[PDB]
Amino acid sequence: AMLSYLRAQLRKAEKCKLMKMIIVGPPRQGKSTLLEILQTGRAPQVVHGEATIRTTKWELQRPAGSRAKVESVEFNVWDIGGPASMATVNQCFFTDKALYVVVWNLALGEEAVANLQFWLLNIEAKAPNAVVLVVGTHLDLIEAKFRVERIATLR
Ligand SMILES: Nc1nc2c(ncn2[C@@H]2O[C@H](COP(=O)(O)OP(=O)(O)O)[C@@H](O)[C@H]2O)c(=O)[nH]1
Structure with a gap:
């Protein structure tokens, strides 16, 4: 670790905040x-x-209360x-040490959730040291009154 750190200092290392x-x-x-609503907030x-x-490309500024060591982060999205037909092809694009987000429709619920295992496995097959989030869309299609006891169950 000392030699790696000294090489970083010696080779004028810069801080890379860009991530996959x-x-x-x-x-x-x-x-x-x-991606659109997260980028714009509209x-x-x-x-x-x-x-x-x-x-x-997408930049994110640190939110209020953040303890992060960076003012912002950048993503090569x-x-x-x-x-x-190209699903077998698309498997190649997954890599390790990258951030993943899986998108599925809440309105389908369990029908979609089962299928998620496929996609989830496809990441872990080629990304053992990666963090993957999974997000349910169409929350507006879920009744607000039931929403909690629905979403928690689905969670
Ligand atoms: N009402 C509603 N529609 C959504 C929501 N999220 C996504 N959509 C719909 O999803 C569509 C975009 O899907 P898209 O990403 O192009 O599908 P893809 O073929 O899998 O890439 C839009 O026309 C939206 O109507 C949501 O939270 N609420």
């Missing part, structure tokens, strides 16, 4: 809508294409989808 973001899920779940406005892959 991957968006995963079955077709028609709101991956692009997810209701979606963009009509997104049919391309299997969409690439962009990949979003892979498209026809299921």
Whole structure:
């Protein structure tokens, strides 16, 4: 560790805050809508294409109460989808030491959740040391009055 640290100092090492973001899920779940609203904080406005892959960049400022050591973080955002025929292909794009987010529709509920195992396994097969979040969309389609006892159950 001492030699690695001394090499970092000697080789004028800089702090890299850029990281990999991957968006995963079955077709028609709101991956692009997810990325859009998270980037902008507004209701979606963009009509997104049919391309299997969409690439962009995203900066996040630290929220109030954050104890982080960085003012902000940056993500080189990949979003892979498209026809299921290329699913076997898309498996190659998963890597380790990257952030994953799986997108699924809450309205389908358990029907979607079962399928999640497939996608989840596909990440752990090629990303043992990666953090993957899983997010349910279409929360507006869940009745607010029942919402808690629904979402917790689904969780
Ligand atoms: N009402 C509602 N619609 C959503 C929500 N999240 C995503 N969508 C829908 O998802 C669509 C975008 O899906 P998209 O990401 O292009 O599907 P993809 O083919 O899997 O990439 C939009 O037309 C939205 O109507 C949500 O929270 N509420």
